A paper describes a structure:
The PEtN transferases include EptA (also known as PmrC)15,16 and MCR-1, the enzyme encoded by the first identified mobilized colistin resistance (mcr-1) gene. PEtN transferases confer resistance to polymyxins by removing cationic PEtN from a donor PE in the IM and transferring it to one or both phosphates of lipid A. PEtN-modified lipid A reduces the overall net negative charge of the OM, compromising polymyxin engagement. PEtN transferases are structurally defined by an N-terminal transmembrane (TM) domain and a C-terminal periplasmic domain (PD). PEtN transferases, like EptA and MCR-1, have been proposed to utilize a Zn2+-dependent, two-step reaction mechanism.
Using single-particle cryo-electron microscopy (cryo-EM) coupled with antigen-binding fragment (Fab) technology, we determined the structure of full-length MCR-1 bound to both PE and lipid A, revealing two distinct, distant ligand-binding sites. The structure includes an N-terminal domain of five TM helices (TM helices 1–5) and a C-terminal soluble globular PD. The PE density appears as a small hairpin-like shape located near the conserved catalytic nucleophile (T285), within the predicted active site pocket of MCR-1 formed between PH2 and PH2’. Situated nearby are a cluster of conserved residues, including the charged E116, E246, and K333; polar H395, H466, H478; and the catalytic T285. A larger, multi-armed density lies over 20 Å from the PE density, situated directly adjacent to the BH, atop TM helices 2 and 5, and in front of PH3 and PH4. The shape of the density accommodates a KLA molecule, including both the 1- and 4’-phosphate groups, the two Kdo sugars, and four of the six acyl chains, and was modeled accordingly. From the MCR-1 structure, multiple charged residues (D102, R184, K187, R190, and K204) can be seen surrounding the phosphate groups of the lipid A acceptor and are critical for function. Using AlphaFold2 predictions and MD simulations, we show that MCR-1 likely undergoes a major conformational change involving rotation of the PD from the PE-binding site to the opposite side of the BH, where KLA is located. The MR6 Fab, required for structure determination, binds directly above the TM domain and adjacent to the PD in our structure. This likely hinders, if not impedes, the movement of the PD from State 1 to State 2, thereby explaining a lack of State 2 particles in the cryo-EM dataset.
Residue numbers in the entry:
A (entry chain C): 8 to 105
B (entry chain B): 10 to 541
C (entry chain D): 4 to 126
Amino acid sequence: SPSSLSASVGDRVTITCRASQSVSSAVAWYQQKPGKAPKLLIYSASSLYSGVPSRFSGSRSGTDFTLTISSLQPEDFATYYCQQSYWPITFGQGTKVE
Amino acid sequence: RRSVSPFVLVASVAVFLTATANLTFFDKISQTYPIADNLGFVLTIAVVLFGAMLLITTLLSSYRYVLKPVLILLLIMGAVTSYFTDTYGTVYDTTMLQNALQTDQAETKDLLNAAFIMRIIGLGVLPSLLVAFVKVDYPTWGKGLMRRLGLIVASLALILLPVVAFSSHYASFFRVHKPLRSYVNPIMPIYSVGKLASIEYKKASAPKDTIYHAKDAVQATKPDMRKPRLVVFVVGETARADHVSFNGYERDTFPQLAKIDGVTNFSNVTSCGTSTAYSVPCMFSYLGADEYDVDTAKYQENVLDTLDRLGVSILWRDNNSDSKGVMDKLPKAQFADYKSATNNAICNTNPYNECRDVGMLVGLDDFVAANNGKDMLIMLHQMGNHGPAYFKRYDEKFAKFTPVCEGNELAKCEHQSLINAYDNALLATDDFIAQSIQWLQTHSNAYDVSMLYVSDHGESLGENGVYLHGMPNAFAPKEQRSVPAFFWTDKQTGITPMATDTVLTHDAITPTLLKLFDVTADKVKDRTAFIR
Amino acid sequence: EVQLVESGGGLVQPGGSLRLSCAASGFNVYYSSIHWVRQAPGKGLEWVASIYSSYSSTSYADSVKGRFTISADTSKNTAYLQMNSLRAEDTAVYYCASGNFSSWWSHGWYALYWGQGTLVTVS
Ligand SMILES: CCCCCCCCCCCCCC(=O)O[C@H](CCCCCCCCCCC)CC(=O)O[C@@H]1[C@@H](NC(=O)C[C@@H](CCCCCCCCCCC)OC(=O)CCCCCCCCCCC)[C@H](OC[C@H]2O[C@H](OP(=O)(O)O)[C@H](NC(=O)C[C@H](O)CCCCCCCCCCC)[C@@H](OC(=O)C[C@H](O)CCCCCCCCCCC)[C@@H]2O)O[C@H](CO[C@]2(C(=O)O)C[C@@H](O[C@]3(C(=O)O)C[C@@H](O)[C@@H](O)[C@@H]([C@H](O)CO)O3)[C@@H](O)[C@@H]([C@H](O)CO)O2)[C@H]1OP(=O)(O)O
Ligand SMILES: CCCCCCCC/C=C\CCCCCCCC(=O)OC[C@H](COP(=O)(O)OCCN)OC(=O)CCCCCCC/C=C\CCCCCCCC
């Protein structure tokens, strides 16, 4: 089930996912537009994938991994999912911005 | 030609082995992880591989007077393993070496070919002569030991430092990509040799008793108040479940079974393993594929021992290699091999001078007469589609798919030319099965005949580079485990087979054999069987 | 480039069957990685299975275990997910996503590219 946690827009946002397994090297986030396939933005919980000028930075804090967007978002407004572990794979509950 | 230190020769041997003997592993690494996007990981992989090779060479060449023989042995072993891991895409595990040590010279001769001889001469014999024909001086024990540790610490550093610098990458590699660790030579052969030696020691230390499993197995009705039964269980060598006509195939490789009424073929049968020595005991053991252990297969009670004890006389007519440890607790007079012309009366019908399978039906009437009145289980072993010589398992009468791959190397013949020979050998197997069915039918007036066929493993014919069976049970391709299964019985015996779409494995053989003679054993009763 | 596209949607009845396809174009060959992720209408993504065609290693997500079975045709560069005994909850949009490439000191192995998705409606 989806959840509109931040729902702020126009400032930095922070969305957290709880990783039951640490696996800090197998945590990634996805930007699913409302009708299209999800993107890959931010992988390994600390690195960046091509397609964004460091807007989404991402970081880690103990067992909890969070997403940070620095600049304003005139284009975005999609849903983000935390992804814990690679074998097997579990996704989070999702987030929405407005 | 100045005297070279032993350590530089050891380093050169390690470099040569990591360069030439790991072609398949390097190709797999460069194809799974592209060199254009994983430069650091592949470089560290090469460095750690060289470090492991150097460590192995330094540890087994610690002494001075054995340096050269050990180097010669390592070079020859590496070349001989690398040829087979390259052309045929096979790995070396404990089961693979067990198969290697249970071979006969006739089978080995087919693998021998000019290209293999040239490759060893070039890779493990020419370097052998280069190493053996140079002068080496051994310094004092103190400086020699100092340089030996220096090399040991250098190899350990080259192994560990890339691991630490690439901790996450190597953790993922060792967690997910385990099978590539089996493609490296000659380290994997050494580990397999050690594991096999440990297994052999445990087997020798093991007792010589029988661990019973069917003590409660009792025959429902004896062969005095009913028509005695007679089952010809045709153990099959290499065959693929998707290459038979019934389960879908463009060509017609089984035409002689379509005209025989009562033949039922199950579309999904997965064998116990990818090798005959690992699969044949698993067919007849009361333990399923999840519990069966090859190391103790012969010590455990098999369905054959139960059938013989209950009063059903059994016969085995070997054709491929050996009973593989299943026909051992029964008298030697019952196991009669048919590999040589001393027993097989139908031979020399081909230029290859091979003894076929149809000759194994010459003389069964004598055994039937000698066992007139009691149940019999005349089990027949097949040569099947045994490679790498598919063109030698059939007569010219079945030379129907042209052209055929007459060459001794699979990598040179085109895929279609190999498919044709494989399907021709399948046609020969079809003819043997049909003749067995007719021989069963000619005894219908005095026995309740039945026939069951199942192959021990599948085959690889070029998919993803694999070309022969022998891959480990953990990650073998599905083509090495999909086997055909046929069951035919007379329409009056009242034996109702399962549906053709039922999902069965090699664990269904023992319950079927027990159900054929109406034997119920609680160890295996709650298992799916080929018949109701 | 990568052009993973999906096919084999359409209407199915409960207790029926279906069989999808993926892995078009060359991309990173075909073998290794490539997964299956589904999305119920108005719900978050849920992982289904992960084929590793080469080593015959697969996985399932419990709720989709015992009915799903993944095949792999490397010759044609296409992955198949066989579905049996569907129920009402099985309706969703299904994607397939590979994973590869680590650059330097960065790792990877994530479900990176996807497809347009094929609707699988049960009724
Ligand atoms: C001479 C000096 C040598 C120095 C050695 C240095 C290494 C030090 C080791 C430290 C260990 C730290 C552990 C840790 O800190 O953690 C680890 C951390 C990972 C970091 C790695 C450490 C960093 C090292 C970096 C430096 C080196 C690179 C996590 C992990 O490693 O993963 C864990 C694994 N741990 C290891 O492997 C230790 C393993 C470490 C592994 C890494 C080693 C890398 C190679 C080192 C090379 C060094 C150069 C030489 O150490 C070993 O011994 C390996 C020794 C190799 C040296 C031999 C050299 C050869 C020449 C010898 C000459 C003298 C382990 O897997 C289990 C087995 O895997 C293989 O078995 P196989 O044989 O393949 O079948 C291993 N076979 C090997 O390794 C051998 C090796 O590969 C081949 C040789 C390679 C040679 C090197 C090539 C060089 C190329 C390199 C290229 C880079 C075997 O190892 C053993 O025991 C072997 C034992 O010695 C026997 C010894 C017998 C004696 C004979 C010796 C002969 C000597 C004679 C000589 C003449 C091990 O027991 O358990 C789970 C997963 O398993 C489960 C699970 O629990 O989930 C269980 C099971 O599932 C079941 C179940 O049964 O339960 C099955 C069913 O029933 C089913 O039902 C399911 C389920 O239910 C489904 O229905 O369940 C299983 O099937 C699996 C499946 O995948 C799931 O499907 O899942 C993992 O936990 P997890 O992932 O963390 O969660
Ligand atoms: C003198 C020239 C050679 C110089 C080098 C000397 C060292 C090696 C000398 C002998 C090596 C010759 C290879 C003989 C292997 C024969 C067995 C074989 O490949 O077939 C097994 C089996 C057949 O299936 P089953 O029905 O179970 O067979 C059982 C009855 N045959 O086939 C396979 O598993 C596929 C084989 C693919 C090719 C691999 C060949 C065997 C492995 C390499 C050689 C043996 C190990 C070499 C040293 C390893 C480390 C000590």
